[PDB]
Design an enzyme around this catalytic site. Sequence first.
Site, PDB file in Angstrom:
ATOM      1  N   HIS A  64      47.184  17.380  76.939  1.00  0.00           N
ATOM      2  CA  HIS A  64      47.570  16.289  76.029  1.00  0.00           C
ATOM      3  C   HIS A  64      47.453  14.930  76.632  1.00  0.00           C
ATOM      4  CE1 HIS A  64      49.049  19.417  73.459  1.00  0.00           C
ATOM      5  NE2 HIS A  64      49.737  19.914  74.517  1.00  0.00           N
ATOM      6  N   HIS A  89      52.348   8.936  82.692  1.00  0.00           N
ATOM      7  CA  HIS A  89      51.120   9.433  82.057  1.00  0.00           C
ATOM      8  C   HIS A  89      50.669   8.285  81.174  1.00  0.00           C
ATOM      9  CE1 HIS A  89      54.530  10.223  79.344  1.00  0.00           C
ATOM     10  NE2 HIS A  89      53.674   9.665  78.429  1.00  0.00           N
ATOM     11  N   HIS A  91      48.327   6.909  77.467  1.00  0.00           N
ATOM     12  CA  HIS A  91      47.812   7.162  76.103  1.00  0.00           C
ATOM     13  C   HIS A  91      46.683   6.202  75.899  1.00  0.00           C
ATOM     14  CE1 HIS A  91      51.380   9.486  75.000  1.00  0.00           C
ATOM     15  NE2 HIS A  91      52.015   8.649  75.816  1.00  0.00           N
ATOM     16  N   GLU A 102      50.583   3.114  72.099  1.00  0.00           N
ATOM     17  CA  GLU A 102      51.510   3.785  71.164  1.00  0.00           C
ATOM     18  C   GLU A 102      52.327   2.728  70.472  1.00  0.00           C
ATOM     19  OE1 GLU A 102      53.350   7.431  73.104  1.00  0.00           O
ATOM     20  OE2 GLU A 102      51.865   8.032  71.638  1.00  0.00           O
ATOM     21  N   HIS A 115      53.308   5.202  80.395  1.00  0.00           N
ATOM     22  CA  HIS A 115      54.686   5.538  80.336  1.00  0.00           C
ATOM     23  C   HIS A 115      55.170   6.131  81.654  1.00  0.00           C
ATOM     24  CE1 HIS A 115      54.263   6.032  75.756  1.00  0.00           C
ATOM     25  NE2 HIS A 115      54.525   4.814  76.139  1.00  0.00           N
ATOM     26  N   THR A 196      57.320  10.727  72.170  1.00  0.00           N
ATOM     27  CA  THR A 196      56.230  10.454  71.202  1.00  0.00           C
ATOM     28  C   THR A 196      55.279  11.660  71.026  1.00  0.00           C
ATOM     29  OG1 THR A 196      54.706   9.494  72.790  1.00  0.00           O
ATOM     30  CG2 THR A 196      56.332   7.948  71.713  1.00  0.00           C
TER      31      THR A 196
HETATM   32  N1  LIG Z   1      55.099   9.498  75.459  1.00  0.00           N
HETATM   33  S1  LIG Z   1      56.600  10.112  76.085  1.00  0.00           S
HETATM   34  O1  LIG Z   1      56.973   9.375  77.312  1.00  0.00           O
HETATM   35  O2  LIG Z   1      57.669  10.294  75.013  1.00  0.00           O
HETATM   36  C1  LIG Z   1      56.098  11.745  76.730  1.00  0.00           C
HETATM   37  C2  LIG Z   1      54.847  12.319  76.497  1.00  0.00           C
HETATM   38  F1  LIG Z   1      53.891  11.703  75.760  1.00  0.00           F
HETATM   39  C3  LIG Z   1      54.463  13.512  77.028  1.00  0.00           C
HETATM   40  F2  LIG Z   1      53.209  13.957  76.720  1.00  0.00           F
HETATM   41  C4  LIG Z   1      55.341  14.225  77.825  1.00  0.00           C
HETATM   42  S2  LIG Z   1      54.723  15.802  78.467  1.00  0.00           S
HETATM   43  O3  LIG Z   1      55.987  16.600  78.831  1.00  0.00           O
HETATM   44  O4  LIG Z   1      54.048  16.641  77.348  1.00  0.00           O
HETATM   45  C5  LIG Z   1      53.621  15.734  79.892  1.00  0.00           C
HETATM   46  C6  LIG Z   1      52.481  14.814  79.474  1.00  0.00           C
HETATM   47  O5  LIG Z   1      52.571  13.512  79.980  1.00  0.00           O
HETATM   48  C7  LIG Z   1      56.622  13.666  78.109  1.00  0.00           C
HETATM   49  N2  LIG Z   1      57.590  14.306  78.913  1.00  0.00           N
HETATM   50  C8  LIG Z   1      59.040  14.022  78.890  1.00  0.00           C
HETATM   51  C9  LIG Z   1      59.557  15.206  79.624  1.00  0.00           C
HETATM   52  C10 LIG Z   1      59.489  15.216  81.034  1.00  0.00           C
HETATM   53  C11 LIG Z   1      59.949  16.357  81.726  1.00  0.00           C
HETATM   54  C12 LIG Z   1      60.424  17.464  80.991  1.00  0.00           C
HETATM   55  C13 LIG Z   1      60.456  17.456  79.600  1.00  0.00           C
HETATM   56  C14 LIG Z   1      60.005  16.308  78.909  1.00  0.00           C
HETATM   57  C15 LIG Z   1      56.949  12.437  77.555  1.00  0.00           C
HETATM   58  F3  LIG Z   1      58.138  11.885  77.801  1.00  0.00           F
HETATM   59 ZN   LIG Z   2      53.925   8.810  76.602  1.00  0.00          ZN
END
Ligand SMILES: NS(=O)(=O)c1c(F)c(F)c(S(=O)(=O)CCO)c(NCc2ccccc2)c1F
Ligand SMILES: [Zn+2]
Lengths: 261, 261
Positions: A64, A89, A91, A102, A115, A196
């Site tokens: 993703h 990570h 976007h 975003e 982020h 998100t």
């Molecule tokens: N955009 S966001 O910061 O709300 C976001 C993501 F977009 C996202 F893809 C993720 S992920 O877990 O799929 C890894 C890809 O970057 C997290 N993760 C928040 C999180 C971290 C640790 C455990 C559970 C959730 C995440 F927080």
């Molecule tokens: Zn994110």
Amino acid sequence: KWTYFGPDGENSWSKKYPSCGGLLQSPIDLHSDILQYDASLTPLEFQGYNLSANKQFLLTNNGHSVKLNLPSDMHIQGLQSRYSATQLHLHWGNPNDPHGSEHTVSGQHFAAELHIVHYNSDLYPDASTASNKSEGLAVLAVLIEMGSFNPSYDKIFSHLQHVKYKGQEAFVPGFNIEELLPERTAEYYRYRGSLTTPPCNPTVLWTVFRNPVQISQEQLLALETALYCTHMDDPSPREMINNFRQVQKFDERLVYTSFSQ
Amino acid sequence: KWTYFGPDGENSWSKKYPSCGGLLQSPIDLHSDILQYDASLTPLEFQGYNLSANKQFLLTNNGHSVKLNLPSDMHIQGLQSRYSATQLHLHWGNPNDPHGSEHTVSGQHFAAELHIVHYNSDLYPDASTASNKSEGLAVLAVLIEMGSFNPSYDKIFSHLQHVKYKGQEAFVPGFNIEELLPERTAEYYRYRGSLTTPPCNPTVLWTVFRNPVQISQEQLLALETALYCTHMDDPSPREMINNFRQVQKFDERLVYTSFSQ
Ligand SMILES: NS(=O)(=O)c1c(F)c(F)c(S(=O)(=O)CCO)c(NCc2ccccc2)c1F
Ligand SMILES: [Zn+2]
Ligand SMILES: NS(=O)(=O)c1c(F)c(F)c(S(=O)(=O)CCO)c(NCc2ccccc2)c1F
Ligand SMILES: [Zn+2]
């Protein structure tokens, strides 16, 4: 099972992940009708962001986005609990429409968005456990625009060709994560929202910095072209592009700003 | 049941209405990256729009918008088939954020949006059977901004305080519907999209005029504050506000413009 395009795209996320159709969803358009200056908001302090170059940190294509694991000794102060880093990570959009941030500001997408995800280490043992609990998460968002070459973001981008496919991992030497932040971090937008991505838990305290950073045209094209969502051995490969969620309704609420002009 | 807010709001429409999660969804942000001038886009002709002042047309609060029925002798000429009118209706925001158009232009939401819905009467017997068919529908959209009072739009708005509640109806004496259209109707954006409400069928040829019209602050406020989604009976009224869908991804596709930029 979820994507950003096609049958399992964002309008269908709420089928399997009910919170994606729940309260407090992010991201949002930040615009003047919903902003309120809050003079009590203080500058965040970033501690332990300067990672040792003798240490290394795992870069993972998770299907993703591309994430960099960060150590729990990295933390933010200035919030009402200590938050410790877990990962960062990005976007982004696509080469025909390179406007994949975003959050938007006054309607406008930026090219991309970083982020930096943190969890409430005062309340919770780790990020997973925190993620679906009250006050669980705090995410820093940096808006990215096309501009000058950015050697700090290149510390991540130069490894992309080693994580092209889902599941692939590579290590990245420690660098100063603060160099990914903009100008004048003291000015930001702050609001309660959500992840998100599925599962879209409404457990995120967002801070979106007011000032964007720049990366070059070439860096942004490399990001948009480097990665695939699928595993090597997938019969139907899918490029990792447009991995941002559209902005959500944001009604009878307010985003607080640390700047009044 | 479907709404624009809460558990039955737009991220959950795909549960009941699968096409809301399918392809070709509207509305969209109209921005340069995805625009292309198409010199073969000719002016539409609006025939039968000068509705008989001796006839009355039914205005209805349907719990989702306010709709005016239109007669099938009103049509658009210029497309491959004749499309005949069926109804028009509006989308708006709320007094605290009075930006409730569906389509956006370069990220900018206008105050409200008028849709005049037509069906392919050459191929199909009526709107309901045309709506899930290919080439079935053509909708004209007029972006609306706050400014000057608009006597033409008041021919509809002056009845709002009389259809406050769901299922209530008024009659509107015929007037020239072309008076609702903006200047230089030959200038528009054209794309293949969908209904922006459930069932979201991907069967609409969209024509969004380039130029907005203006309605006064008082007119906009009346539109935003007059109406309820609920019946007059209901001890828990819901205000009919923010009845627009967020913009949809629009990737690997173009919107064609009859004006050059
Ligand atoms: N955009 S966001 O910061 O709300 C976001 C993501 F977009 C996202 F893809 C993720 S992920 O877990 O799929 C890894 C890809 O970057 C997290 N993760 C928040 C999180 C971290 C640790 C455990 C559970 C959730 C995440 F927080
Ligand atoms: Zn994110
Ligand atoms: N944004 S839109 O132009 O695509 C739209 C609406 F917003 C809308 F509310 C309606 S509705 O009032 O009919 C009820 C919810 O769909 C239609 N309806 C178009 C239509 C007319 C006759 C038969 C089938 C569909 C409709 F087409
Ligand atoms: Zn409509």
